[PDB]
Amino acid sequence: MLGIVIATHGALSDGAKDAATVIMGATENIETVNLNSGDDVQALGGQIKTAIENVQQGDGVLVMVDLLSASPYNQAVLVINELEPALQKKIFVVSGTNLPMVLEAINHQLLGTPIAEAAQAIVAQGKESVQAWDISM
Amino acid sequence: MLGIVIATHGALSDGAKDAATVIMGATENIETVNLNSGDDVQALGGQIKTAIENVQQGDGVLVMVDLLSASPYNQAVLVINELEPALQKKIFVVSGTNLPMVLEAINHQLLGTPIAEAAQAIVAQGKESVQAWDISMTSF
Ligand SMILES: [Ca+2]
Ligand SMILES: [Ca+2]
Ligand SMILES: [Ca+2]
Numbered sequence A: 001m002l003g004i005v006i007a008t009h010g011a012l013s014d015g016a017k018d019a020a021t022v023i024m025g026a027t028e029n030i031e032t033v034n035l036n037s038g039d040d041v042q043a044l045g046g047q048i049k050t051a052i053e054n055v056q057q058g059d060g061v062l063v064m065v066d067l068l069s070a071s072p073y074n075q076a077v078l079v080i081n082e083l084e085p086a087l088q089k090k091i092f093v094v095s096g097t098n099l100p101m102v103l104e105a106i107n108h109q110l111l112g113t114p115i116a117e118a119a120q121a122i123v124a125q126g127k128e129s130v131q132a133w134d135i136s137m
Numbered sequence B: 001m002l003g004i005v006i007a008t009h010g011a012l013s014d015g016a017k018d019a020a021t022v023i024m025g026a027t028e029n030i031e032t033v034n035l036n037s038g039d040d041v042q043a044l045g046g047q048i049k050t051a052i053e054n055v056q057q058g059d060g061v062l063v064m065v066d067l068l069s070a071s072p073y074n075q076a077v078l079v080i081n082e083l084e085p086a087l088q089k090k091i092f093v094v095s096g097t098n099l100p101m102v103l104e105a106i107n108h109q110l111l112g113t114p115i116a117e118a119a120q121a122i123v124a125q126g127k128e129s130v131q132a133w134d135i136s137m138t139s140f
Helices: A012-024 A041-055 A071-080 A099-111 A115-128 B012-024 B041-055 B071-081 B099-111 B115-129
Strands: A003-009 A030-035 A061-065 A091-094 A132-134 B003-009 B030-035 B061-065 B091-094 B132-134
Touching: A003 A012, A003 A041, A003 A071, A003 A099, A003 B012, A012 A030, A012 A099, A012 B003, A012 B012, A030 A041, A030 A071, A041 A061, A041 A071, A061 A071, A061 A099, A061 A115, A071 A091, A091 A115, A099 A115, A115 B132, A132 B115, B003 B012, B003 B041, B003 B071, B003 B099, B012 B030, B012 B099, B030 B041, B030 B071, B041 B061, B041 B071, B061 B071, B061 B099, B061 B115, B071 B091, B091 B115, B099 B115
Parallel strands: A003 A030, A003 A061, A061 A091, B003 B030, B003 B061, B061 B091
Antiparallel strands: A091 B132, A132 B091
């Protein structure tokens, strides 16, 4: 089954995962990594690899991060570079991660969707799910 | 000062503020609401209304929910629909909030950006922030 690793600053990863459980009832094969104040980013790389390895079942791993170009994103990309080219081509990194994206990801987990096709699907959803509303509409 | 109310299923709203705190330091005028397994949605209605009121200061309020068309969102709308006219015109609801949208919101809070203008900018950055990277982009 597709693996998911949500990596972020603070407890955002645990929260996104908590929110998905409230909506779905349960979740499976989803690890969360947190970068806290005073954490050495040197170690984040290690926690991200451990997590990826803990969800790899042979269908790839979706590494969902919070902020493009921030530490979680950087370390994720850098760790991927040091893995066997085999899974290396099955690991995708999505940024700007939001609940709709995590839900879409879980959806592909259940569907068995090939990760490359899943990644695009998640990116579309995420973007399309960002809109504003006001009383004038 | 612009007010912000992050409302989500579970602890997501608290995790977003924590993450944003980790990056920008101590924030101000940000309320977090949660909808947990078992909670009554009407109660969430009042919870949002309260958060909105504890943060409303003349410059409007950004209500950041997690998912479009779900209880947090639907209740935000129901609440805003029954608010006194001088207040409702300035409350905006943005969906699919991610860390970048929150950080962007905190920035407009500091700039004093007019809310209708801040909302459009938060949506643009939010959409722009969603991307995917894979080893093929680095392989030649
Ligand atoms: Ca964890
Ligand atoms: Ca709160
Ligand atoms: Ca008060």
